[PDB]
């Protein structure tokens, strides 16, 4: 069955008591709960086991005997854990051999195995050593055999990656070993501090008397708040302990896990980092709970002593990546980490959701109650009355209402006037300064000390992790190796581009290119009310945009002269995203413009041509002509490129007219240097070259269905010119609009030259995924409301027209595609009726489950400001959402296939010594190597679709969901619908190896 909320909170209390090392409290609570008949039923075996282990670690035998008497009296039979704890304590106390003989003889009478004791998950290495010493008394020798390291994966797709009989050319960095070790020390200290301070990049404020007065007042308020928070924390601790001594549950051990100073510092950081509009109570609560769990994991590691083990293993591991050092046998970084001997990192038990929300709420209430401020800041001592800093206000949306903490209006003005020149970032949000830890298991990886989860999910979900941990160990090797390869790409920031961006941003901003503008340059009876409303709104959006830009630019300027790495993880489907949110290459055009590779490569014979093709692709003017025409066009506009590179702001300004600004500039800056060099074939390029794929989902449908016309339509066959379905759909829509406009309808006249590929691209893409007309209307409206050359008053009448015509253009565009989509949709629905969520396995081997469940019926926490309502993700007892599982089956499957293709390509590029990074379907590299990647890509695609993916999926679905005969009629229906798979066509995938524009 499943545990109740109190049965979770009590277990969490007992487990936390072991870490906090207050066993008397746990013993008292257990005795009180066992004594009363009503609370006796709540206690389970694990609650006795936790206290028994805690007592055994100390070395008290009387208490362990008493708890064993309690558990034998209450009910149930002792399990292996109780006997393991008994042996551990008996060995601790140097018990006589006769007692050990008797205990183990009884244990054999029940009938178990001593090996399972040393394979117990809970027991650590020290506990295992102690119990081994204890058992060595009765048996003079006891041993557990070692084994060969985990076998390499044996599958059709991944065989070549893990085969030793071959030639390997694994790359290496460009840095000395000592520099790498120093960077490791810097990153370790940074993570231990848990904060970084960055010098603000905004325009400095000239000193004045008012600024100094504001700073002094701020300092005084900070000191007063610190003292008040310390006193409040002490009082709360005492009050919560008194409840424990009354035989009631509380959060005393949870609040005793960290020092008072650290909690106070975290609370002041949260107060200093509060937006002027405030935040909802539930959001502030999840944030405070999460920050406390991270600080406890880092501090536990520091106190125990794993920090030193990581330092030694890492410093020895850094020999593989450094250029100077050499490895006896080259291998994948995960393989070397395992072979070098792996320190054991024990997973941290996640707190239950109710406890997390309760702790967050308690901390937020303490923060709001403890801080107070004088009412009159400008006028000192006018009134001795003290006003709260934060206020609890309701905000009403439709019937519903929300609670919000809002700062006092004078505090915001004081902060604005003070203009502190230092921003504070959390260590998790900043890019690392040392190479990432190799992903060796789902539990450990990415950051040095902070906890990072493999599959990013909601704060309480656990089904994905248990599915990951229940699979064979060798299945996830490919995914882990791909993640490690992606995270091991050194980065750097461009200098002159950053200087130009700073010049534009600091002075006035250039909203045309993308740089926001300062609030100073802002626009300025019913009519007056409307004008003020518009002004306030516009000021709000511009302020938010400038705040985000300020954060990103400050972070970028901090790393001006450093090398940094970006770790990656994945979602539940399988697509990979970088971990640092603020600054990465997945962001806007400026983000893609500032970043560049750190390890350059010579251009070679075929580097300049690919650079020119990349420049033309970024420009966007020529996207239908072949490669020769793009190269010729790049040749034609050489003067404009050189002028833009030499004079970016004072000149002909050709680059600003590109579709992708700030990247055309960088590419021109590189191309001019390459051209002006004495030998352009011996020039080092640090600039990645993008490589995109057209109609990727349509490509995967074409591959699975093997439909000849569909394959030919999406560049999946050899051709001389690119093929685009979107352009054909746009042409058909334009023909229909021309006929309608000649007939006389006004909206046809309104939108005449605004039917481009952009407006219909997303809709045509998402039709095959089963999008409805409402979503298509919203997409077309969103596209239309940004042209700025279209009369907006027709938008509702425009999109509502276009969608229909667009859907018209699709009676019979796809047949096998829609057959496959309908089959998947019907299978998902029929599975969803029986109450079982749909699951599948990707060709790489990772398992995917789609967690859509009906809402929990009530979930509130009682309290002294408001009753927080929170969803209970983490209840497997709820019923599945048939509507959201039906709609999401195709897109998740195709995204998983895309991720598999990307991972295979990345691994086979790493084997040849390539710097491969990717964004979903865009494959970056150095300029010289692009052609090589192209080849392997096609190969992988063919292999990825050489296996019968659809047949394997059908058989797996039949095995998993039709084995149970519980509903015989519906089981027969599901068997019938799953045993009918659409037949393939007549298409030989070898032609993919020769097609030029499959990726272009």
């Amino acid at each position: 069955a499943q545990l109740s909320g109190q049965q979770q909170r009590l277990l969490a209390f007992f487990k936390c008591c072991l870490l906090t090392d207050q066993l008397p409290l746990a013993h008292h609570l257990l005795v009180v709960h066992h004594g009363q008949r009503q609370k006796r039923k709540l206690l389970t075996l694990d609650m006795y086991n936790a206290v028994m282990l805690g007592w055994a670690r100390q070395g008290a035998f009387k208490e362990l005997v008493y708890v064993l008497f309690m558990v034998k009296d209450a009910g149930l039979t002792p399990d292996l854990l109780s006997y393991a704890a008994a042996l551990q304590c008996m060995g601790r106390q140097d018990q006589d051999a006769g007692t050990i003989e008797r205990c183990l003889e009884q244990m054999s009478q029940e009938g178990l195995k001593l090996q399972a004791l040393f394979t117990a998950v809970l027991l650590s290495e020290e506990d295992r050593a102690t119990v081994l010493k204890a058992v060595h008394k009765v048996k003079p020798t006891f041993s557990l055999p070692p084994q060969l390291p985990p076998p390499v994966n044996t599958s059709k797709l991944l065989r070549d990656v893990y085969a030793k009989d071959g030639r390997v050319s694994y790359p290496k960095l460009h840095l000395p070993l000592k520099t790498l070790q120093c960077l490791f020390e810097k990153q370790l200290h940074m993570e231990l501090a848990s904060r970084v301070c960055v010098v603000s990049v905004e325009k400095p404020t000239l000193p004045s008397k008012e600024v100094k007065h504001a700073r002094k007042t701020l300092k005084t308020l900070r000191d007063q708040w610190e003292k008040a928070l310390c006193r409040a924390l002490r009082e709360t601790k005492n009050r919560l302990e008194r409840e424990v001594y009354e035989g009631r549950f509380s959060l005393y051990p949870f609040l005793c896990l960290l020092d008072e100073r650290e909690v106070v510092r975290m609370l002041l950081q949260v107060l200093q980092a509060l937006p002027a509009q405030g935040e909802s109570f539930t959001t502030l609560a999840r944030e405070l709970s999460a920050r406390t769990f991270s600080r406890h994991v880092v501090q536990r590691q520091r106190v125990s002593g794993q920090v030193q083990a990581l330092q030694n293993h890492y410093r020895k591991y850094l020999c593989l990546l450094a250029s100077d050092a050499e490895v006896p046998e080259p291998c994948l970084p995960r393989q070397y980490w395992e072979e070098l001997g792996a320190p054991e990192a024990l997973r941290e038990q996640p707190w239950p959701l109710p406890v997390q929300m309760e702790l967050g709420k308690l901390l937020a209430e303490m923060l709001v109650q403890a801080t107070q401020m004088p009412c009159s800041l400008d006028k000192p001592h006018r009134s001795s009355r003290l006003v709260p800093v934060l206020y609890h206000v309701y905000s009403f949306r439709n019937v519903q209402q929300i609670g919000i903490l809002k700062p006092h209006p004078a505090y915001v003005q004081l902060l604005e006037k003070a203009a502190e020149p230092t921003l504070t970032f959390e260590a998790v949000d900043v890019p690392m300064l040392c190479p990432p830890l190799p992903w060796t298991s789902p539990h450990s990886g990415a950051f040095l000390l902070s906890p990072t989860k493999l599959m990013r999910t909601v704060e309480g979900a656990t089904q994905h992790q248990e599915l990951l941990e229940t699979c064979p160990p060798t299945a996830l090797h490919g995914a882990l190796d791909a993640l490690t390869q992606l995270g091991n790409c050194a980065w750097r920031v461009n200098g002159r581009v950053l200087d130009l961006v700073l010049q534009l941003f600091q002075a006035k901003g250039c909203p045309q290119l993308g740089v926001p503008a300062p609030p100073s340059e802002a626009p300025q009876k019913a009519e007056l009310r409307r004008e003020l409303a518009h002004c306030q709104k516009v000021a709000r959006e511009m302020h938010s945009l400038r705040a985000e830009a300020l954060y990103r630019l400050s972070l970028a300027q901090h790393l001006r002269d450093r090398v940094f790495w970006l770790p990656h993880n994945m979602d539940f489907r399988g697509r990979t995203y970088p971990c640092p949110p603020h600054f990465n290459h997945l962001g806007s055009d400026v983000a893609r413009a500032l970043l560049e590779f750190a390890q350059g490569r010579p251009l070679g014979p075929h580097g300049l041509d690919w650079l020119k093709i990349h420049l033309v692709n970024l420009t966007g003017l020529k996207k239908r002509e072949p490669l020769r025409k793009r190269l010729a066009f790049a040749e034609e506009v050489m003067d404009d490129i050189l002028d833009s590179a030499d004079q970016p702001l004072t000149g002909r300004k050709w680059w600003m007219g590109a579709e992708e600004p700030w990247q055309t500039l960088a590419c021109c800056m590189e191309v001019a240097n390459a051209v002006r060099a004495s030998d352009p074939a011996a020039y080092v390029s640090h600039l990645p070259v993008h490589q995109d794929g057209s109609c990727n989902g349509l490509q995967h449908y074409a591959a699975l269905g093997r439909d000849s016309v569909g394959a030919a339509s999406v560049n999946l066959e050899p051709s001389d010119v690119p093929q685009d379905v979107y352009s054909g759909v746009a042409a058909q829509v334009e023909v229909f609009r021309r006929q309608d406009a000649q007939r006389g309808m006004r909206v046809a006249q309104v939108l005449e030259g605004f039917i481009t590929r952009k407006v219909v691209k997303q809709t045509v893409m998402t039709v095959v995924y089963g999008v409805t007309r409402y979503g298509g209307r919203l997409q077309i409206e969103k596209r239309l409301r940004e042209l700025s050359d279209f009369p907006q008053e027709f938008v509702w009448e425009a999109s509502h027209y276009l969608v229909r015509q667009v859907f018209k253009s699709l009676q019979e565009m796809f047949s096998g595609t829609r057959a496959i989509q309908h089959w998947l949709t019907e299978s998902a629905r029929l599975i969803s009726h029986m109450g079982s969520v749909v699951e599948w396995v990707t060709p790489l081997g990772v398992p995917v489950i789609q967690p859509y469940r009906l809402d929990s019926k009530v979930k509130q926490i009682g309290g002294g400001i408001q009753s927080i309502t929170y969803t209970h993700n983490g209840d497997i007892s709820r019923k599945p959402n048939t509507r959201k599982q039906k709609n999401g089956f195709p897109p998740n499957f195709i995204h998983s296939l895309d991720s598999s293709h990307m991972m295979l390509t990345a691994l086979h590029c790493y084997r040849k010594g390539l710097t491969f990074v990717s964004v979903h379907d865009c494959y970056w590299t150095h300029a010289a190597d692009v052609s090589v990647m192209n080849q392997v890509c096609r190969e992988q695609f063919v292999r990825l679709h050489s296996e019968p993916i659809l047949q394997d999926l059908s058989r797996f679905l039949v095995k998993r969901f039709c084995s149970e005969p519980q509903k015989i009629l519906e089981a027969s229906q599901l068997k019938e619908t799953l045993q009918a798979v659409p037949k393939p066509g007549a298409f030989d995938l070898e032609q993919v190896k020769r097609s030029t524009y499959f990726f272009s």
């Binding site: 206020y391 949306r397 919000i404 006092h408 004078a410 008053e793």
Partner: protein
């Protein structure tokens, strides 16, 4: 379903109630959803100047037959009173209409707020949309926009029993006292001009004219005494402190004060303003332990004006437009 007058006795009783005043009977009565035209024909027999606002086109020619011979007394305009001045923007479709266009086609000029009532709208509230219609009317009235832009136009509408009871709740606390009652009794003078059993009104569904014993069965299910309620906007609604710019803060204050019904005024005031709550409650005259439910609408308006009249503190409210749309 839509309710249309069915009998001539009703057609004359309602007409007499509408045009009861014998001194200056001339008003350009605006009648909405005429339906068959029985009420309009009765009003013409009594003598008036009707600007009919039918929603459906099918009835439009039919009314044209009744008033074809009459020259200027009756004007049929295809419009809906409850869709005037859409806030979405764009082109105004024929089913909707803009207030300026209507008051230009009718020739009505602009009348100051303190002056006499220019017009008189009559009709029935939506069958299932009383709350939304009342809230839209409240926003239009408190902001001097749309109809109430031109003046303090009287509105006389048929409403149900439950919404009327919720609209006429007092500090006597029948546990129906809420913000809608406060604003509507602060901005109007609600009176029960007449009462009618609901079965006395013909019911036409969107599908067609309702018939069959189901109509008789429906009669027992929804039997409630419909009230014809008269609303005139109050002359002294707007003051120095209460202006069309500051109505949002008053609305937020009233909504917040009813978030916790069983709470005192001082707690909400602490949650809403940085001012000394005890001093304010001393100025307004009420006691410290004053419940929100035991406050009159005039007390709420006086409290809001007293807070807004505080010169000493530069910052008065924590209300901000960022608190909306979230």
């Amino acid at each position: 379903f839509k309710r249309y007058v069915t009998d001539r006795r009703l057609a004359e009783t309602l007409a007499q109630i509408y045009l009861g005043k014998p001194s200056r009977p001339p008003h350009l009565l605006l009648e909405c959803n005429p339906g068959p035209g029985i009420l309009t024909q009765a009003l013409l027999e009594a003598g008036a100047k009707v600007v009919a606002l039918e929603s459906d086109k099918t009835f439009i020619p039919h009314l044209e037959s009744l008033g074809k011979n009459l020259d200027g007394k009756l004007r049929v305009i295809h419009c809906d009173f409850f869709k005037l001045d859409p806030r979405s923007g764009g082109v105004i479709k024929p089913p909707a209409m803009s207030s300026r266009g209507l008051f230009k086609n009718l020739g009505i000029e602009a009348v100051p707020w303190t002056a006499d009532i220019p017009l008189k709208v009559v009709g029935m509230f939506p069958s299932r949309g009383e709350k939304r219609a009342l809230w839209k009317l409240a926003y239009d009235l408190y902001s001097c926009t749309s109809i109430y832009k031109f003046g303090r136009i009287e509105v006389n509408m048929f409403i149900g029993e439950k919404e009327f009871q919720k609209l006429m709740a007092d500090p006597g606390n029948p546990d129906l006292y809420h913000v809608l009652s406060v604003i509507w009794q602060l901005a109007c003078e609600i009176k029960v001009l007449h009462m009618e059993p609901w079965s006395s009104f013909d019911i036409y569904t969107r599908k067609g004219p309702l018939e069959n014993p189901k109509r008789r069965e429906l009669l027992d299910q929804l039997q409630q005494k419909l009230y014809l309620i008269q609303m005139i906007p109050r002359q002294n609604l707007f003051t120095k402190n209460l202006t069309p710019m500051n109505y949002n803060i008053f609305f937020h204050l009233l909504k917040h004060c009813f978030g916790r019904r069983s709470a005192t005024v001082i707690d909400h005031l602490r949650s809403l303003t940085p001012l000394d709550a005890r001093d304010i409650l001393m100025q307004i005259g009420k006691q410290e332990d004053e419940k929100v439910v035991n406050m009159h609408p005039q007390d709420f308006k006086t409290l809001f004006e007293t807070i807004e009249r505080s010169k000493d503190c530069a910052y008065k409210w924590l209300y901000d437009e960022t608190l909306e749309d979230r």
